[PDB]
């Protein structure tokens, strides 16, 4: 079903095969659904380094799944700005194979104690995408599933 | 905060330098910390960059030659280079990201010439 | 790829008029852009960042507003000290990351 009512940009399988994933037979087939640069799609794979991978949703390496990445700039990206959205920018350390943190705490940045006002040397951590119409391809609001 | 940079001099093709970012007031291995080149009479150039995990990415022109490291018994950043005639002859500063794409808080330069 | 280039490149203004400074970014871009200021021999110092998000310590003097494509930086006052250089950047992905672009001159 997924063929034949949405168009993909990035179908990719690792372990598995895309023909031959009707006739098998699997205990718990999960999904995991989010929102991602069109330029950043490439860092939901096993392994791999950056801001998404590291810090927000890491792969593990022996893994038997498929990715499902496929434009969005039609309807997700909004009139004048798309704010919703946000990434983990700042986390103190990787993340173990699929894992997740919603903390909207302070970051800390430097050894003096860090009050709940972010001012300087402390960051709100989630940064906010921008979505506008008007933006290159590269910069495009994508789905991965 | 300041970030005081040391090493440098004159090295030969072929040789090798190492290159100490001191910073009193922020934490290297808490904050994005790169390396930004420049040539004299030229426009600037990003070398590495050193995430609070254990992450590093290289640009093009100083893949393989060049390697980060990030040392938290003395809060300093190093880097360490192995010359070549047109790779470095740059003065070299040290900055911190912010908002994931600004650089602040940049140090002094270090001349390092090849010769 | 994204590729940043200036328009004025060398410039001439005097104390009493302002200056206007673009930098495009081709394939489009993201509201995410820093300005920098470089008098020669010094470390530069960031001037503007974000979508003109202004900073503490840089005078309200400076005001760089822009949206999409096209990104550009305006000053108001004479300008006592005469200003150098000035950079434009951008992140990008993994092979690229940090570009800054070709730089800019304003003089008396």
């Known amino acids: 079903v997924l063929y034949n009512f949405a168009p993909f940009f990035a179908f990719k399988c690792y372990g598995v095969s895309p023909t031959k994933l009707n006739d098998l037979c699997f205990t718990n087939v999960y999904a995991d659904s989010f929102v991602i640069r069109g330029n950043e799609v490439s860092q939901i794979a096993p392994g791999q380094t950056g801001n998404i991978a590291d810090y927000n949703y890491k792969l593990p390496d022996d893994f038997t799944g498929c990715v499902i990445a496929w434009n969005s700039n039609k309807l997700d990206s909004k009139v004048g700005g798309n704010y919703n959205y946000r990434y983990r920018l700042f986390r103190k350390s990787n993340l173990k194979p699929f894992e997740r943190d919603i903390s909207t705490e302070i970051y800390q940045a430097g050894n003096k104690p860090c009050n709940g006002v972010a001012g300087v040397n402390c960051y709100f951590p989630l940064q906010s995408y921008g979505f506008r119409p008007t933006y290159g391809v590269g910069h495009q609001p994508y789905r991965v599933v | 905060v300041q970030l005081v940079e040391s090493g440098g001099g004159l090295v030969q093709p072929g040789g090798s330098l190492r290159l100490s970012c001191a910073a009193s007031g922020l934490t290297v291995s808490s904050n994005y910390m790169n390396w930004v080149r420049q040539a004299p009479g030229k426009g600037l150039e990003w070398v590495s960059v050193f995430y609070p995990g254990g992450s590093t990415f290289y640009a093009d022109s100083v893949r393989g030659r060049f390697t980060i490291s990030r040392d938290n018994s003395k809060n300093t950043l190093y880097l360490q280079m192995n010359s070549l005639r047109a790779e470095d002859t740059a003065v070299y500063y040290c900055?911190?990201?912010?908002?994931?794409?600004?650089?602040?808080?940049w140090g002094q330069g270090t001349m390092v010439t090849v010769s | 790829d994204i590729q940043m280039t200036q328009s004025p490149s060398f410039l001439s203004a005097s104390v009493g008029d302002r200056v206007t400074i673009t930098c495009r970014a081709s394939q489009g871009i993201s509201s995410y852009l820093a300005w920098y200021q470089q008098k020669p021999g010094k470390a530069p110092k960031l001037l503007i960042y974000?979508?003109?998000t202004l900073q503490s310590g840089v005078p309200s003097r400076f005001s760089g507003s822009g949206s999409g494509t096209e990104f550009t930086l305006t000053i108001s006052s004479l300008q006592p000290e005469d200003f150098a250089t000035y950079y434009c950047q951008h992140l990008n992905s993994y092979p690229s990351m940090y570009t800054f672009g070709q730089g800019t001159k304003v003089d008396i």
């Open positions: 974000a979508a003109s």
């Open positions: 900055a911190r990201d912010h908002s994931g794409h600004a650089l602040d808080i």
